[model samples]
Target: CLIANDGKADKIILAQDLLNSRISNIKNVNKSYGKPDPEPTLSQIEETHLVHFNAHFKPYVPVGFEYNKVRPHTGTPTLGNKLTFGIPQYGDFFHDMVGHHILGACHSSWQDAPIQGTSQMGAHGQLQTFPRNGYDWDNQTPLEGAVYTLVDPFGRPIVPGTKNAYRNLVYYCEYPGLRLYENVRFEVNGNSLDEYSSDVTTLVRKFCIPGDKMTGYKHLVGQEVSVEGTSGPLLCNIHDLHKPHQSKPILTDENDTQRTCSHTNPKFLSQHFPHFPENIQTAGKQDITPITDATYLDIRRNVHYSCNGPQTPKYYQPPLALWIKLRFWFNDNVNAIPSVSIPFGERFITIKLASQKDLVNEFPGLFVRQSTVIAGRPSRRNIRFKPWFIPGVINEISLTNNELYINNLFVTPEIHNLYVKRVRFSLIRVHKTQVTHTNNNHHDEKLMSALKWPIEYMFIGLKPTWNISDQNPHQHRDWHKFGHVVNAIMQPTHHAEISFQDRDTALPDACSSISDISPVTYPITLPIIKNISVTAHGINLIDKFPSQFCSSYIPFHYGGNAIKTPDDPGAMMITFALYPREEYQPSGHINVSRAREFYISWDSDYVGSITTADLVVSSSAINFLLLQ
Candidate 1:
């Protein structure tokens, strides 16, 4: 390919010439070079976002010479049936005539070679060499044949003809006195190749040299080069072109020395995975494993790099390493309900779930079992759980055995109310799986005796009186929210209790001062009159699924406590209490005394007042809306 400047100031010229002549069969060819072909008229080319740093440009050499012409292919091939009309019929005849009789059987007497008693006469197989009749499969044959006699920087075979093969052959000096722009001379075995490039402040020096003159390979051991740059004899053969050059810092006085220390603490600390206990208080007292232990070192980090480079400064600061700060609800056990916050560094680290053996090893006194259940609320008749219509609030809700996997349960500011509403439903039927804390082991007896109940129904309804100082209170104060109280019940109970008021102190005392008492509480004067149980069954929970699923409301305020607050002027506090229990039931009136008889009766599509005499008894999870 040839490129020449055009006569016009703005235009350019381009031409492509073939090295071999187009004429064929010229046995005794003359040395007349063929004419070169010119490209199209030059014009300004528009720049593109594409790059060719590590890739090849187009107009690639065709795989075969037959496809090298301007028009390599035409339209699709001709009709198909006529082209194969007689071939199929002929193929069947050939299959039965020649192919079917392929099996031939015969027995004939045979003798060893031409010799009877003497050893068999010798015969040799044919040995011949011929040019390959097909296309070449080896793409690098030309490169191999070019550098077959030479070795690379590491004393390994390579093709230095290509830039990529020798770009890493960089040279540098560690002498601090060798400043940038200062003339430097590179020589091999006392033979100087005259003046070359100058020294660089970065210390790494890269220069172009003839392939034959390059003595950077390991084979040139005694012939190691010397680098001199004016000032003094910086020492010859002390630096290897193939290896890194590490020199001392610039000296200020006559007396000078070089010092170096690679801190192992950062490297040592990077290996281990720090564990956070469900109880934050226990985290501070947790036993520490020696950083040098095989166990600690064996836990390889997901993100790590070599700290061997001299580019990093010493005694300045520790190398960048991982710092994982975990937060949890005070009473929530690590192995309790499964959850995850998406904002956490899920990509940076692997959050390994603990196995039964691992959990037993960590806390021997703790017993574990996993239970599974679907997301929707389970009714008396529709035993299968239906999906809950809490969009952003809930990503997933499923349980296995005794284990509950509720994903994205954390409350974000965007949907905090929706989160609370879903949580209320979970509390409504919390008795399905109960946590038992028996005083068995003397050691774990005191540790396990907290938050032993299943239902914290009232805890979820209480609103915080305190104003949140931070827009996102859950982020920074994760440490405070977790580990303050060891009892699981008070964690969320305290969370709701602390919401109304801001914290006054730090550390362990942050959540301690807040009293969890709810502001409103009035008695149920006629307990049975206010309560009624209705069972609905065979109600296709999967019909329209959650879209058409029945919505229920439980009273947040009880009688006298039903006073509305200024924060919510048109508050639905009383309205929610007036709504009916079942889907098909008649709407309720604002006046409390208007329908006393209607309160106990249910106009349900799936339920009936007729009682059965079979004496069969069964208990369903308490549906709070049925009682309100």
Candidate 2:
């Protein structure tokens, strides 16, 4: 049967020709203009976060076998193959009706080559060019000029339509197949042209170029330009742009000549996923298998405790020991053993509970307290009421008991008595006071009698003795000769220098000789008072002596050590004397000029002018005396 239509054929040819021509023109233009002279290298396009279009196209197929059942057959074999042509038919023979055959053919023809109006084909299809009956004899089909429909390769219809054509019919097909074709196209309009034009005109006016029109070419020339008005064109070349400028020339000094620029490339360290090197052969082609292993076990160890009770007759408290056990498992052997020690109140015990393998498991074995009991003394005992495997599944265990009994029994002891009392004694020193007289006269006697001695310079001898019980005389002898002497002579008031001498004289003992008699200078002031007292108040002794001496002496005699003489060989000997000025009378002592000072004149006839004393006295006087 013929299946060709003039309208449908014209539309197909028109659309195909236009599309092919446009594509051909694009290819030609790109081939001429797109080639680079130097053959630009292909730069890798950066991995952009963009969306890509992916689609699938499928040909349409109708539902059911209705068309196959009604079509007419020719004189050719209707039921059997050529080899079985002579075989008789068993079923009722029915003649396929020409009316049904014609109707089916018409339906298929309309579907394949649907008529298109001007609105559907947009003035370009065959139906729009010649509707209803414009076919020529030369182009007509064989069946007495009846039009032939165009069908797709699968004998399904391809209706003549643009996007607008066959809208309802296409929807009917696509709705069942869910095959809507979506086409996206991009276009740009000249929206930014006006903005760019305004900017360029303003820039040109600001530079005050010569003519009304400054082409992009003329503006490239070097020339000074003045921009006028607030909103005018401004022009500048690269050299005239506002950028940092160097004012002074760089000096190639010795320091600059010696300097060298160091270029160090930074290294980036990153922790990346597992990777296989390019050189190494990887098993990427092989199928991968994931492996996992798991296990469960128990860990065990030791425990201990201490006790103190009345039943045991020990002088001190003692300790008790116990054992513990744990269970666990490891992926591999753990190098070190894991253990735990818990300290309890009053009595402490170490629970040594873990094994090396227990730590290997990510989940460790935990021990829960069950119950505990204490009994006995000096060797106390504890009984723990624990479960072997109580409440939940238990894997590991640790046990401990106190090892030492702790108590306050040894901390306290009874005391008989404590002595607290004081025994007082008087210390005395005896010495021969030497008086040096320049001439023998009753007046000198009166001067000596009127003079009051300065206690600081009046050295006296101290001889100490001891009084112990009547028994053990020798015990008291050493005590008296050494102990008492040390006590009396070494008192704070006395600055005693002691030296030992051998009884055998053939060696000429160094300590017994007069040359060995090195003087020990004591603090000249009273023991109870310090020089800081006078210095702190800024009171010079030369000005305040008389009043200070009277008030100070009363307290000195009341609160100070009394004068005494020692009788033993280690006796403290006094050699110096300090007397008040001879000019000052005892009674009616007026404030005379000599009362403010005293002359420490050495007797040349007696001591033969001490050269060292002269040096010392001269130095001392330099700091104290006001030389006129």
Scored by TM-score, the top model is 1
> Model 2 over residues 1-628: C-alpha lDDT tens digits?
5534435658664454554465556556656787533322222111221223533358943222111121212222211210101101111111111111000000010111233421133211121222222232222332222222222221133423421121111000101100100111111121110011111222212222333454432222211123332333332211111123422234344543322221220110011111222346656443222121011111223333332221122222122111111111111122110110101112111111112111111110111111111122111222111111111121222112111111111111121111112222221111112223232211111111212222222211111112122222122122223112122212122222234543644543232211111122221211111111111123332222222232234223321233222222221111112211111122122221334333222111111222111101000000111111
- The models' CA-based lDDT, in order, is 0.20, 0.20
- On the 0 to 100 scale, the lDDT of residue 39 in model 1 is 26
**Candidate 1 clash total?**
20
Give the worst 10-residue stretch by lDDT in candidate 2.
614-623
* Global CA lDDT computed for model 1: 0.20
Instruction: State every prediction's TM-score relative to the real structure.
Output: 0.10, 0.09
| Model 2 steric clash total | 47
Q: State the displacement of the C-alpha of residue 116, model 1, in Å, after optimal TM-score superposition.
A: 94
Q: Model 1 reaches what TM-score against the true structure?
A: 0.10
For lDDT, the strongest prediction is 2
